[PDB]
Amino acid sequence: TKERFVISRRRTGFGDCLWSLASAWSYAQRTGRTLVIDWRGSCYVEQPFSNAFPAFFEPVEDIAGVPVICDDRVNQLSFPGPFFPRWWNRPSIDCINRPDEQIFRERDELTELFQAREDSEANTIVCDACLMWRCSEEAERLIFRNIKLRSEIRARIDALYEEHFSGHSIIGVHVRHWADSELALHQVCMAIRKAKALSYPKPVKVFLCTDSAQVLDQVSGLFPDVFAVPKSAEMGIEGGASALIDMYLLARCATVIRFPPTSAFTRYARLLVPRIIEFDNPGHLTMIDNP
């Protein structure tokens, strides 16, 4: 009997990476495979063959009973064929072309596999597409609970929590992005007003997570008590750490505004925070009590 594998490959924002990881983990658990976390080529790491996972998280060799390889051994080990999806059996020269249509086909092929009664005969499942929504919420929570941020990142979160969150009820706001910008800023303001009109047990502050300096300046000038975390290889890692700090602090808020709710950036917060506000029909705000 020989070892068999599921490789979780993802290189995008951490919300997507970690949700897609939960999906790979769930299939590895169901089928008695080893899980390989392969974050080579991450948007946050300049060096293309370095596995980014250890740059942000502590070593992990097991997640809830599933053995894990999470480090540079991906560059030494030869994971065994045959492979699924079937594309991965093609010669390497034929794998240079990897268009979005093929990645989407593999999402669908993996989705069907994960729903099928029988385990694949392939010795290695290669997951190299978006696997958001292709697992249970429990699988997602298990991943967050069973990997640990690097201590340097945790210390920053801890200091920020003490400095702004402790003693207070925090409304977290994630804003990812002429007439369009004005309407979007207006919509964000409407969401903040809605959130602020709810009752909270402690004095309220607004935690803003945005990639735009202009949004930060505007929202800060429109509401009281708005704060944000202050902010080339080294600067990619710093971008990653900054993202994680915001993602994890959002999950500590009393209410979170998801602009948009399709962003996996706020999925961790959606799982944990008591109340979620978002535009959902369109132009209209909704509030969701957790669950």
Side-chain angles (χ1 to χ4, degrees):
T1 312
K2 299 177 185 192
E3 194 168 358
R4 289 165 17 114
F5 302 84
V6 179
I7 306 178
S8 185
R9 314 203 77 239
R10 207 81 187 120
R11 299 170 297 285
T12 54
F14 289 115
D16 182 353
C17 293
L18 291 169
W19 198 338
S20 296
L21 182 58
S23 298
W25 174 86
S26 175
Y27 195 70
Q29 195 193 206
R30 181 199 135 187
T31 63
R33 297 169 184 266
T34 291
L35 180 68
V36 179
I37 310 182
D38 181 4
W39 291 3
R40 288 177 296 174
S42 170
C43 59
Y44 297 114
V45 175
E46 191 188 60
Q47 298 78 15
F49 315 122
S50 178
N51 192 345
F53 183 87
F56 300 103
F57 292 91
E58 295 187 340
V60 54
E61 303 87 24
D62 179 279
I63 296 171
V66 170
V68 175
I69 298 166
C70 73
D71 62 20
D72 284 340
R73 285 176 289 168
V74 298
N75 289 327
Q76 317 161 31
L77 296 170
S78 290
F79 296 113
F83 304 92
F84 184 94
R86 296 188 224 306
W87 186 93
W88 290 86
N89 295 301
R90 297 199 208 296
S92 293
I93 190 65
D94 289 0
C95 288
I96 296 293
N97 189 28
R98 187 172 173 77
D100 279 3
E101 68 171 289
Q102 179 60 34
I103 299 168
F104 299 151
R105 175 173 313 129
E106 292 179 26
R107 176 194 66 214
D108 293 346
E109 288 166 10
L110 288 164
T111 296
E112 174 180 44
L113 179 64
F114 295 172
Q115 290 160 183
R117 178 183 349 288
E118 303 310 334
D119 185 23
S120 177
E121 293 308 293
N123 290 319
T124 296
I125 310 306
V126 183
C127 300
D128 199 357
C130 184
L131 294 181
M132 292 165 52
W133 306 101
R134 303 306 196 272
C135 65
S136 64
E137 178 203 311
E138 286 71 35
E140 291 174 74
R141 293 175 182 282
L142 197 145
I143 288 301
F144 282 105
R145 291 180 61 83
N146 291 282
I147 68 177
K148 186 165 189 175
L149 283 165
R150 283 284 178 191
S151 62
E152 324 80 44
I153 301 177
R154 290 197 264 96
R156 290 171 69 188
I157 288 165
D158 294 340
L160 291 156
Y161 185 85
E162 170 52 20
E163 287 154 2
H164 302 283
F165 281 69
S166 177
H168 288 83
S169 285
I170 305 304
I171 294 165
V173 188
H174 175 233
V175 181
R176 178 82 162 188
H177 89 247
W178 171 45
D180 294 353
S181 52
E182 288 186 5
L183 178 68
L185 180 67
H186 181 65
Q187 289 181 337
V188 170
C189 295
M190 310 187 240
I192 295 168
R193 294 178 183 126
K194 172 176 177 72
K196 279 184 76 195
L198 302 177
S199 289
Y200 298 90
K202 302 182 188 105
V204 165
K205 302 173 62 179
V206 175
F207 173 52
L208 184 56
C209 294
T210 185
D211 55 359
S212 173
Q214 287 59 213
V215 175
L216 178 58
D217 292 345
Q218 296 154 176
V219 172
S220 298
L222 285 161
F223 297 92
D225 304 304
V226 178
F227 70 99
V229 181
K231 71 210 277 201
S232 191
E234 297 104 69
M235 105 193 239
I237 300 292
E238 179 50 38
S242 181
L244 290 163
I245 293 161
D246 278 353
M247 290 173 65
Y248 277 73
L249 282 172
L250 285 165
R252 303 286 283 279
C253 294
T255 293
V256 178
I257 292 164
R258 302 184 77 189
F259 197 90
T262 51
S263 179
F265 194 97
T266 45
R267 181 54 174 185
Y268 187 36
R270 172 62 183 80
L271 291 170
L272 294 180
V273 168
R275 295 139 131 182
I276 299 94
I277 287 174
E278 69 206 29
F279 284 86
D280 247 17
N281 215 104
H284 296 115
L285 279 162
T286 195
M287 227 221 60
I288 304 176
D289 291 302
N290 201 348

PDB file of all heavy atoms in Angstrom, residues 39 48 57 63 91 108 171-172 179 184 232 237 246 248 272:
ATOM      1  N   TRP A  39       1.617  26.484  -1.817  1.00  0.00           N
ATOM      2  CA  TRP A  39       1.437  27.899  -2.077  1.00  0.00           C
ATOM      3  C   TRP A  39       2.642  28.510  -2.800  1.00  0.00           C
ATOM      4  O   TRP A  39       2.923  29.696  -2.715  1.00  0.00           O
ATOM      5  CB  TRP A  39       1.127  28.667  -0.817  1.00  0.00           C
ATOM      6  CG  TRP A  39      -0.229  28.369  -0.232  1.00  0.00           C
ATOM      7  CD1 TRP A  39      -1.164  27.465  -0.658  1.00  0.00           C
ATOM      8  CD2 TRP A  39      -0.759  28.956   0.988  1.00  0.00           C
ATOM      9  NE1 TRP A  39      -2.264  27.507   0.164  1.00  0.00           N
ATOM     10  CE2 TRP A  39      -2.039  28.437   1.166  1.00  0.00           C
ATOM     11  CE3 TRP A  39      -0.299  29.940   1.847  1.00  0.00           C
ATOM     12  CZ2 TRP A  39      -2.837  28.804   2.254  1.00  0.00           C
ATOM     13  CZ3 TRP A  39      -1.072  30.332   2.879  1.00  0.00           C
ATOM     14  CH2 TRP A  39      -2.348  29.762   3.073  1.00  0.00           C
ATOM     15  N   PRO A  48       9.419  32.512  -7.050  1.00  0.00           N
ATOM     16  CA  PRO A  48       8.306  31.717  -7.549  1.00  0.00           C
ATOM     17  C   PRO A  48       8.234  30.254  -7.104  1.00  0.00           C
ATOM     18  O   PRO A  48       7.178  29.611  -7.225  1.00  0.00           O
ATOM     19  CB  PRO A  48       8.549  31.717  -9.056  1.00  0.00           C
ATOM     20  CG  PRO A  48       9.989  31.848  -9.175  1.00  0.00           C
ATOM     21  CD  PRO A  48      10.379  32.822  -8.128  1.00  0.00           C
ATOM     22  N   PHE A  57       2.370  31.100   8.227  1.00  0.00           N
ATOM     23  CA  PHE A  57       1.821  30.171   9.238  1.00  0.00           C
ATOM     24  C   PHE A  57       2.932  29.295   9.784  1.00  0.00           C
ATOM     25  O   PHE A  57       3.912  29.029   9.112  1.00  0.00           O
ATOM     26  CB  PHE A  57       0.726  29.311   8.606  1.00  0.00           C
ATOM     27  CG  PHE A  57      -0.496  30.098   8.230  1.00  0.00           C
ATOM     28  CD1 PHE A  57      -0.614  30.632   6.998  1.00  0.00           C
ATOM     29  CD2 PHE A  57      -1.465  30.374   9.159  1.00  0.00           C
ATOM     30  CE1 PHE A  57      -1.723  31.401   6.657  1.00  0.00           C
ATOM     31  CE2 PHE A  57      -2.559  31.141   8.810  1.00  0.00           C
ATOM     32  CZ  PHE A  57      -2.689  31.636   7.571  1.00  0.00           C
ATOM     33  N   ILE A  63      -3.701  17.965  10.427  1.00  0.00           N
ATOM     34  CA  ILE A  63      -4.904  18.763  10.681  1.00  0.00           C
ATOM     35  C   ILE A  63      -6.026  17.803  10.900  1.00  0.00           C
ATOM     36  O   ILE A  63      -6.452  17.074   9.997  1.00  0.00           O
ATOM     37  CB  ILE A  63      -5.227  19.770   9.519  1.00  0.00           C
ATOM     38  CG1 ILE A  63      -4.106  20.813   9.380  1.00  0.00           C
ATOM     39  CG2 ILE A  63      -6.628  20.405   9.725  1.00  0.00           C
ATOM     40  CD1 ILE A  63      -4.216  21.684   8.168  1.00  0.00           C
ATOM     41  N   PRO A  91       1.930  15.555 -20.778  1.00  0.00           N
ATOM     42  CA  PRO A  91       3.337  15.936 -20.711  1.00  0.00           C
ATOM     43  C   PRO A  91       3.524  17.380 -20.308  1.00  0.00           C
ATOM     44  O   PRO A  91       2.650  18.209 -20.608  1.00  0.00           O
ATOM     45  CB  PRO A  91       3.797  15.725 -22.128  1.00  0.00           C
ATOM     46  CG  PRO A  91       2.901  14.637 -22.658  1.00  0.00           C
ATOM     47  CD  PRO A  91       1.573  15.013 -22.092  1.00  0.00           C
ATOM     48  N   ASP A 108     -14.959  22.278 -11.849  1.00  0.00           N
ATOM     49  CA  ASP A 108     -16.177  21.500 -12.025  1.00  0.00           C
ATOM     50  C   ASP A 108     -15.919  20.004 -11.896  1.00  0.00           C
ATOM     51  O   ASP A 108     -16.729  19.285 -11.309  1.00  0.00           O
ATOM     52  CB  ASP A 108     -16.785  21.785 -13.361  1.00  0.00           C
ATOM     53  CG  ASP A 108     -17.307  23.207 -13.478  1.00  0.00           C
ATOM     54  OD1 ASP A 108     -17.427  23.896 -12.443  1.00  0.00           O
ATOM     55  OD2 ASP A 108     -17.609  23.604 -14.621  1.00  0.00           O
ATOM     56  N   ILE A 171     -17.359  47.866  14.879  1.00  0.00           N
ATOM     57  CA  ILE A 171     -17.988  47.628  13.599  1.00  0.00           C
ATOM     58  C   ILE A 171     -16.852  47.541  12.580  1.00  0.00           C
ATOM     59  O   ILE A 171     -16.173  48.567  12.278  1.00  0.00           O
ATOM     60  CB  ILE A 171     -18.930  48.771  13.231  1.00  0.00           C
ATOM     61  CG1 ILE A 171     -20.085  48.800  14.208  1.00  0.00           C
ATOM     62  CG2 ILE A 171     -19.497  48.575  11.826  1.00  0.00           C
ATOM     63  CD1 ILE A 171     -20.892  50.102  14.173  1.00  0.00           C
ATOM     64  N   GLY A 172     -16.662  46.350  12.009  1.00  0.00           N
ATOM     65  CA  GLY A 172     -15.654  46.192  10.957  1.00  0.00           C
ATOM     66  C   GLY A 172     -16.225  46.433   9.576  1.00  0.00           C
ATOM     67  O   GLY A 172     -17.404  46.083   9.278  1.00  0.00           O
ATOM     68  N   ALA A 179     -19.061  58.670 -11.243  1.00  0.00           N
ATOM     69  CA  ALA A 179     -20.388  58.329 -10.709  1.00  0.00           C
ATOM     70  C   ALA A 179     -20.395  57.032  -9.917  1.00  0.00           C
ATOM     71  O   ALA A 179     -21.116  56.909  -8.928  1.00  0.00           O
ATOM     72  CB  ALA A 179     -21.405  58.244 -11.839  1.00  0.00           C
ATOM     73  N   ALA A 184     -20.566  54.200  -4.767  1.00  0.00           N
ATOM     74  CA  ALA A 184     -20.021  53.196  -3.858  1.00  0.00           C
ATOM     75  C   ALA A 184     -19.709  53.768  -2.492  1.00  0.00           C
ATOM     76  O   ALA A 184     -19.937  53.126  -1.466  1.00  0.00           O
ATOM     77  CB  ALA A 184     -18.789  52.553  -4.407  1.00  0.00           C
ATOM     78  N   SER A 232      11.580  44.641  -2.298  1.00  0.00           N
ATOM     79  CA  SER A 232      10.253  44.383  -2.866  1.00  0.00           C
ATOM     80  C   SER A 232       9.698  43.059  -2.351  1.00  0.00           C
ATOM     81  O   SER A 232       8.496  42.944  -2.069  1.00  0.00           O
ATOM     82  CB  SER A 232      10.325  44.357  -4.404  1.00  0.00           C
ATOM     83  OG  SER A 232       9.017  44.367  -4.971  1.00  0.00           O
ATOM     84  N   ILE A 237       5.750  40.295   1.455  1.00  0.00           N
ATOM     85  CA  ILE A 237       5.482  39.658   2.726  1.00  0.00           C
ATOM     86  C   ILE A 237       4.748  40.591   3.647  1.00  0.00           C
ATOM     87  O   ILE A 237       3.794  40.202   4.334  1.00  0.00           O
ATOM     88  CB  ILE A 237       6.752  39.160   3.416  1.00  0.00           C
ATOM     89  CG1 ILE A 237       7.448  38.151   2.536  1.00  0.00           C
ATOM     90  CG2 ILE A 237       6.408  38.515   4.767  1.00  0.00           C
ATOM     91  CD1 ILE A 237       6.683  36.865   2.374  1.00  0.00           C
ATOM     92  N   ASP A 246      -5.704  42.206   9.053  1.00  0.00           N
ATOM     93  CA  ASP A 246      -7.065  42.725   8.835  1.00  0.00           C
ATOM     94  C   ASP A 246      -8.113  41.602   8.854  1.00  0.00           C
ATOM     95  O   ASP A 246      -9.174  41.708   9.477  1.00  0.00           O
ATOM     96  CB  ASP A 246      -7.152  43.399   7.473  1.00  0.00           C
ATOM     97  CG  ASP A 246      -6.619  44.845   7.456  1.00  0.00           C
ATOM     98  OD1 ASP A 246      -6.300  45.378   8.539  1.00  0.00           O
ATOM     99  OD2 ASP A 246      -6.526  45.411   6.312  1.00  0.00           O
ATOM    100  N   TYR A 248      -8.105  38.623  10.308  1.00  0.00           N
ATOM    101  CA  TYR A 248      -8.298  38.085  11.636  1.00  0.00           C
ATOM    102  C   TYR A 248      -8.931  39.096  12.596  1.00  0.00           C
ATOM    103  O   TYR A 248      -9.786  38.731  13.401  1.00  0.00           O
ATOM    104  CB  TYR A 248      -6.952  37.528  12.126  1.00  0.00           C
ATOM    105  CG  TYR A 248      -6.640  36.132  11.637  1.00  0.00           C
ATOM    106  CD1 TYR A 248      -6.283  35.854  10.335  1.00  0.00           C
ATOM    107  CD2 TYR A 248      -6.647  35.038  12.518  1.00  0.00           C
ATOM    108  CE1 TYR A 248      -6.011  34.608   9.902  1.00  0.00           C
ATOM    109  CE2 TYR A 248      -6.349  33.800  12.082  1.00  0.00           C
ATOM    110  CZ  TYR A 248      -6.020  33.543  10.792  1.00  0.00           C
ATOM    111  OH  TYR A 248      -5.710  32.266  10.337  1.00  0.00           O
ATOM    112  N   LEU A 272     -17.661  33.853  12.137  1.00  0.00           N
ATOM    113  CA  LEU A 272     -17.542  34.125  13.595  1.00  0.00           C
ATOM    114  C   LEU A 272     -18.333  35.295  14.182  1.00  0.00           C
ATOM    115  O   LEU A 272     -18.695  35.240  15.360  1.00  0.00           O
ATOM    116  CB  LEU A 272     -16.080  34.268  14.005  1.00  0.00           C
ATOM    117  CG  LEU A 272     -15.164  33.037  13.907  1.00  0.00           C
ATOM    118  CD1 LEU A 272     -13.736  33.412  14.364  1.00  0.00           C
ATOM    119  CD2 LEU A 272     -15.712  31.963  14.750  1.00  0.00           C
TER     120      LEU A 272
END
